[PDB]
C-alpha cells in the first residue's frame, strides 16, 4: 500500500440559465 | 500465469461498478418525476442496491457509495471527489444520470485492504 | 381559419414546434370561439408536450411586455385573432 | 391637526421602537458574535 | 403525522361545507348580477363575485393540489401509522408490565406516595392514550379506518386504565382506612 | 381626469400591492396610449419593486389563462382597458 | 477483519415549487 | 498518559476532520455569493485543503473527501452515504453548511490500512 493523492473527479451540472428575453407585442389597434 | 488472474480478481474495474450503478439507478428511480418524500428512499435504495451488488463480487474491497439526487430547477450543481488511496489497486466511479425532472449523481468507491 | 393567413410577427422557438403552435391555435380556434377556452386548450397541449410552464393570451385587441424563455416564443396572428405563446417559470 | 400630529406620534413611537430594537439587536450581535468567535478559537480537540 | 391529520380533518370539514359554499357562491352570483341588472352602483370596498370567484377558484385549486398532496402522502403517513401503531403497542406492553408489577396494591403502606405512584402511571397512560388517540385520528382522517383500526393496545391501555380506576378507588377506600389507622396508631 | 374606477375582477395579492397595481396602471394609462408601453411601465415598476419575474398584459379584447405564484395575481379593469398582471419566472 | 454494513448518512434540505395557480381571464363582450 | 493519545492518533477521530472541513470551507468559499465560475475552485479548494490537513494528522488511513455545493434557487438538497468498512476502526464525517446564497455538504471518510 503506497498512499498517494488521487485525481480530482469533477461533475459540474451548471445552472442552465436563460438570460430571459423580454419583448413587447401589440395587436395593431384594428377598427 | 496465475498472478495475472489473481491481479484481475482484486482489481477495480470502473465499468462493472458503473453498470451496477446503472442497474441500481434504473431499479430504484426508473423514470418517475421528482417527489421529495421519495428522494430519501431513492437515495437509500440506490446506495443499498449498489452496496448489495458490489458485495456479491467477492473482491477484497472496502466500498463507499455516495449518492446525489436533484430536481431540475435551474439551480447549479458541482460535486467533487479527490481521495487518498493506493493507486495500484484502488479506484473510483462517478456516474451522471438524468431524466426529465431530475439529476442523479452517484460516486462509487472501492479501496483494497 | 378561413383566409386568415397565419403570419408570424416574432419567433424565438423552433420551426416544427412553431408549426405545432400554428396547428394548435388552428385546431383550438376550430373547436372553440371564446378565447379563454382556446387558451386553456393551448395550455393543456403545450404543458403536456413541452412541459410546465407556458403562458398564452388569445385575443384581438391587447398589448404586452412579457418575458419568455429562449426557444419558447411566438407571436402570430390567425387573422384578427392574435396568439402570443411564451414559456416562463 | 389630529391626523398630522398623530402621524408624528406614530413616527415617534415608531422611531423609539426602532431605537430599542436596534439597541437589543446590536447587543445580540455583540454577544452572539463574541460567543461564536469563542467557539471558533476554542477547538474541542485540544489536548488538556 | 398528527398536525397534518388535524389539517386533513379541517380539509374534510371544508369538504362537508363545500356544498353550502358553492350554493353561497351561486347566491352571491345571482344577487350580484341582479344588482348589475337593477343598476346598483357598487363601491370599491365591495369585493365582487369577480373577487369571490377568484378566491373560490383559488380555493378549489389549492384543495385539488393539496388533495394530490394527501394522495401522495398516503404512503408516508401509512408507514407512519404502522410505526406509531406498533410503537403504541410496544410502549403499551412496557407500561402494562411496569404498571402491573410496580403498582402498590396492599394495606401495609402509606397511601399518599401510593396514590402518587397511581397518578404517575395515570399520567403516563394519559400520554400513551394520547399517542393512541393521535394514531387513531391518523387512521380516521387518512382513511385507514377499519373500525378506526382500534388496536389491541387501545384495549390494553383502557383496561389498564379501568384497573387503575379499581386501584385508585380501593386506595381511596384504603386512604380513609389509613387516616383511621393514623388516628388509632 | 375623469374618474377611472378600478373594478378588480380577480385578486390573488396583498391589498398594498393591489392599490399599487391600481396606482401604477393609472400612471401608465395617463403616460401612454399604446398598451405595450402601459404593460412596459407596470412590468418595469413591479420588477423594480417586487422582483423578477412579472408579466403584464394590457388591452380591451383578450381571453387568456395565467399561471402565477401565490399572492401574485391581479386581473382588473381601469375604465374599459383591462390590466392583466401575474408573476412567473 | 469483520467487514459489515455502515449506516446511511443523509442530510436533507427541502425544496419548494413556488406555489402555482392557473386562473382564467376574459374581456367581456360589452352591452 | 501516553497510550490514550496514542489511541487518539490511531482510531478514526471523527470530528477533528470536521475542524479540517470548516477550516477548508472558511478558507475557500468565505462569505461570497453564488457565481458559478468560482464553484469549481471552491469545491476543489475544500477537497484539496481537507486532503491537506488530514495527511498532516499522521494517522494511517485512506481518506475519501466528497463535497456537494448547491445554489439557493428553491432547489432543495438531499445526499446519502452508506458504506462498507470495518466498524471498530472506521467512521464517517458529514457536515452541512449554508449561507444566504449557497448550500454545502462535505462528506469525509477514513479507512484503515
Numbering used by the authors:
A (entry chain J), G (entry chain I): 110 to 140
B (entry chain L), H (entry chain K): 1 to 113
C (entry chain D), F (entry chain E): 1 to 89
D (entry chain A): 1115 to 1162
E (entry chain G): 1163 to 1347
Paper text:
Cytoplasmic dynein is a microtubule motor vital for cellular organization and division. It functions as a ~4 MDa complex containing its cofactor dynactin and a cargo-specific coiled-coil adaptor. The formation of dynein-dynactin-adaptor (DDA) complexes is a key regulatory step in dynein activation. Here, we determine the cryo-electron microscopy structure of dynein-dynactin on microtubules with LIS1 and the lysosomal adaptor JIP3.
Our cryo-EM structure shows two distinct globular densities below both dynein-A and B heavy chains (residues 1160-1230). The resolution of our maps in this region was ~9 Å which is sufficient to identify them as belonging to the IC-LC tower based on its crystal structure. In each IC-LC tower, LC8 binds to the dynein heavy chain-1 (A1/B1) while TCTEX1 binds to the dynein heavy chain-2 (A2/B2). Such a configuration suggests that the IC-LC tower plays a structural role. Firstly, the interaction with the DHCs reinforces the dynein tails lying parallel to one another. The IC-LC towers are docked beneath the DHCs of both dynein-A and dynein-B. As the two differ in motor-conformation and binding to LIS1, it suggests neither factor affects the IC-LC interaction. In our structure the LC8 interaction is the same whereas the additional TCTEX1 interaction is only possible because of the parallel arrangement of the DHC. This additional interaction could help stabilize the parallel arrangement of dynein motors needed for processive movement. The location of dynein-B DIC-Ns is not clear as they remain unresolved in our structure raising the question of how they are sequestered in the DDA complex. The IC-LC tower positioning, however, means they are constrained close to the dynein-B motor domain and the p150-CC1A.
